[PDB]
């Protein structure tokens, strides 16, 4: 959610900044609804005042015939409920527009239409030169009997996986290594979160109202008929960021740095023919998430720090990667500034996204009413929120398998992971 | 699913054994539907034969006027489709009855009506005597700021938890210790499984058709309209056991021993006023599951072995417990024989279920068509399946917190978990 006063005082400058993202703000429709809202607001508040007044005149005469007055208060109450219902419907239309507006991109963000306009910032490591034909992670998984896509189709359907034996153990070692790195070295606190969330949570982080189709939704429970319209989380960012919803945080307690390892559920709509083979684009994937709740003046420095925390995972694992600054046209809905990390994938002969690190500014904080204050201060202000993958675990397994494969299909275990695998040097 | 030939040749002896579970088999309704099914089966197969014959008479005359014959084959095809549809509806009614029949209890199982008729087999450890008033895990969680139920209500709703900091780290250490114990010492292979499963999987392990209300169900995806009616898994037993669905296993490859650590999703219907406070009965909980696929003659020995594997977790953790043999009236739907482990819970002054270990016999194997064969053999036979908690992780955290609490609220870390907590001796 954008600042409502910024839409009222600078609509053309807001519309111009959003135009860089390829978003067309309908200023005229929004202005026409808002002018009508003011007329109905005055009409309704006048009806509210007169009903409150005639209700007080009844209480006076009751202790001092209240029949001609009771009929008047009943008629006024009928008219008021009707006026309030009409105003509430108009407010819902204004909200449908306002809550579908993406975040204003920061001036640091390069202007572009899509992913082809993204800017490479840095590059780390040298992609390995192989003395044999490169096998992809799918072929390697079949050789070990450790990645079974057909069993997952039998259990569930397409875009799911079953991992078995040492490759499932390795997937676990990766998530353990990531959590330990962020909690022991990077100052993040560990969290266990619900994997099902409510509508308030989804509005809070921006999945609602615009991206319901990106999610798996659960049918309400019989004994919780009106309070169990849940969705499976697409990322730990959703429950972690909402932990500060409706809170006033003492500024001395900031930054609040949180991490979680969770499965992530995504419908992956519009991905027809894209990443059809392998672990890259599943409906269910594990991810170690980093979330930071910071003071408004520290968010740009926090983004650099969090991106470096995700880079550290790739460096310790010895996985070559490139760091990309996303352009205006390739950023996610909530982001004002994003860096993507793209890992070398030998079988694809390219770099593939493994992390996305964003500064959300006060966009989610506004929706959630997540505030901070110094003890002295006469007013609070909205916090800034940040989120970054550290990392998507299935995609890390793909990069590890392909980059560390031996001529006979054996997988060398990266040195940093050997303590997490009882010192094991190779799988196979 | 029971053996259809056992229902045909010994219905009264089957009905008698099921009566011990408090299940009343409607022999008369089942016999009346089956006598009608035979009449329709003969009628339909006669129509099938005559249509196949007149279709062959067309192909003869076509290569040798096919108009009076085409009209006959069309009319026969109309009558056949109608007869097949009528027979298929009757088959669906017979299946609704057959698939709602629970497993025949083994002769080892004591007869009883409910949990009060269960038999204590053994007891291990001495419940600690405290020099202070015992705090429950909820009070201890609030003292550490590590178990937050109000944040989970805000994110989702009731019967969910948010764990923060060292208590979330400890919950993770428990699951890691369990997986390592079963994979390194107990001969289980590790698996990563889907947490969403299809209708075939749910029928396979017995959740369908009778217990759809025990589950969270997802609405189908727009791009997978007819193939995505999924449910969240209530236990890793559901995807793991279904890995052998429609398979013929070489008997030399048995036993197949599988383990997985997953969240578990349960509607917890009918639990009004029961375990309202704390982690004991959540909609989402982590569990380390053990599943064994064995030869029919080894299932009773496998049950003893698997129960001992779950007991070992409690013993190494120094948690006092009792082992209970469940009576006929307290067993789950698929089980023919069950042992429950019940851990000492100091604040409740009783033992609480932490594991349930079952021999399912060939009940799920029949539904799944999970078979085995020796290379020589002219026929296959159904395998036996077993499942046991090793253990429910949230309930282990409850037992650990309450049993290891210090006078000031600090939690002593059990010696076996200290290597999983970087040698940390106490939380707080
Ligand atoms: N089906 C899929 C979809 C995505 N991913 C991987 O999740 C990462 C974060 O996703 S995000 O959508 O780019 N941002 C987020 O979710 C933020 N909370 C930061 O993590 C991607 O960078 C990609 O590497 C995957 O592994 N499988
Ligand atoms: N809401 C809940 C419900 C149950 N449990 C814990 O799951 C264990 C296994 O569940 S079972 O239903 O008894 N059998 C099974 O699921 C088998 N697959 C073997 O694991 C119980 O013994 C209890 O300790 C919990 O922690 N929270
Ligand atoms: Ca501080
Ligand atoms: Ca992106
Ligand atoms: Ca974002
Ligand atoms: Ca063997
Ligand atoms: Ca039970
Ligand atoms: Ca069972
Ligand atoms: Cl406003
Ligand atoms: Cl049959």
UniProtKB/Swiss-Prot annotation, chains A, B:
CDD domains: SerRS_core. L-serine binds at residues 235-237, 289, 389. ATP binds at residues 266-268, 353-356. Keywords: Aminoacyl-tRNA synthetase, ATP-binding, Cytoplasm, Ligase, Nucleotide-binding, Protein biosynthesis. One of its GO terms (molecular function) is ATP binding. It comes from the Bacteria. It is found in: Cytoplasm. SUPFAM superfamilies: Class II aaRS and biotin synthetases (SSF55681), tRNA-binding arm (SSF46589). Signal peptide: none annotated. It catalyses: tRNA(Ser) + L-serine + ATP = L-seryl-tRNA(Ser) + AMP + diphosphate + H(+); tRNA(Sec) + L-serine + ATP = L-seryl-tRNA(Sec) + AMP + diphosphate + H(+). One of its GO terms (biological process) is selenocysteine biosynthetic process. Pathway: Aminoacyl-tRNA biosynthesis; selenocysteinyl-tRNA(Sec) biosynthesis; L-seryl-tRNA(Sec) from L-serine and tRNA(Sec): step 1/1. One of its GO terms (cellular component) is cytoplasm. Its EC number is 6.1.1.11. The keyword Protein biosynthesis applies. Homodimer. The tRNA molecule binds across the dimer. Catalyzes the attachment of serine to tRNA(Ser). Is also able to aminoacylate tRNA(Sec) with serine, to form the misacylated tRNA L-seryl-tRNA(Sec), which will be further converted into selenocysteinyl-tRNA(Sec). PANTHER family: SERINE--TRNA LIGASE, SERYL-TRNA SYNTHETASE. Belongs to the class-II aminoacyl-tRNA synthetase family. Type-1 seryl-tRNA synthetase subfamily. Consists of two distinct domains, a catalytic core and a N-terminal extension that is involved in tRNA binding. This is Serine--tRNA ligase. The gene is serS.
């Amino acid at each position: 959610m954008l600042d409502p006063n910024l839409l009222r005082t600078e609509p053309d400058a807001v519309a111009e900044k959003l135009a860089r993202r390829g978003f067309k703000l309908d200023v005229d429709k929004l202005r026409a609804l808002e002018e009508r809202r003011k007329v109905l607001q005055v009409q309704t508040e006048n009806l509210q005042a007169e009903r409150n007044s005639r209700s007080k005149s009844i209480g006076q005469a009751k202790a001092r015939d209240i029949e001609p007055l009771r009929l008047e208060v009943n008629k006024l109450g009928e008219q008021l409920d009707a006026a309030k219902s009409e105003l509430e419907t108009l407010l819902a239309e204004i909200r449908d527009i306002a809550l579908a507006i993406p975040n204003i991109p920061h001036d640091d963000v390069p202007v572009g239409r899509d992913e082809n306009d993204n800017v490479e910032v840095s590059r780390w490591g040298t992609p390995r030169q192989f003395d044999f034909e490169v096998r992809d992670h799918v072929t390697l998984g079949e050789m070990h009997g450790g990645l079974d896509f057909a069993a997952a189709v039998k259990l569930t359907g397409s875009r799911f996986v079953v991992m078995k034996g040492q490759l499932a153990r390795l997937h676990r070692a990766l998530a353990q290594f990531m959590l330990d790195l962020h909690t022991e070295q990077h100052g993040y606190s560990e969290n266990y979160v619900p994997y099902l969330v409510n509508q308030d949570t989804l509005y809070g982080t921006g999945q609602l109202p615009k991206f319901a189709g990106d999610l798996f939704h659960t049918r309400p429970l019989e004994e919780e008929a009106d309070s169990s319209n849940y969705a499976l989380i697409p990322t730990a960012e959703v429950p972690l960021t909402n932990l500060v919803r409706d809170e006033i945080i003492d500024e001395d307690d900031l930054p609040i740095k949180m991490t979680a390892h969770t499965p992530c559920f995504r419908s992956e709509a519009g991905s027809y023919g894209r990443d059809t083979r392998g672990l890259i684009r599943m409906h269910q994937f594990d991810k170690v998430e980093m979330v930071q709740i910071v003071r408004p003046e520290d968010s740009m420095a926090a983004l650099e720090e969090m991106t470096g925390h995700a880079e550290k995972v790739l460096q310790l694992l010895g996985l070559p990667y490139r760091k990309v600054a996303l352009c205006t046209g390739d950023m996610g809905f909530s982001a004002c500034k994003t860096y993507d990390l793209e890992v070398w994938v030998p079988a694809q002969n390219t770099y593939r996204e493994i992390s996305s690190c964003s500064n959300v500014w006060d966009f989610q904080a506004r929706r959630m009413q997540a505030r901070c204050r110094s003890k002295s201060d006469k007013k609070t202000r909205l916090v800034h929120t940040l989120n970054g993958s550290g990392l998507a675990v299935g995609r890390t397994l793909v990069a590890l398998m392909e980059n560390y494969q031996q001529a006979d299909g054996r997988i060398e275990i990266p040195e940093v992971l050997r303590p997490y695998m009882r010192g094991l040097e190779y799988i196979g």
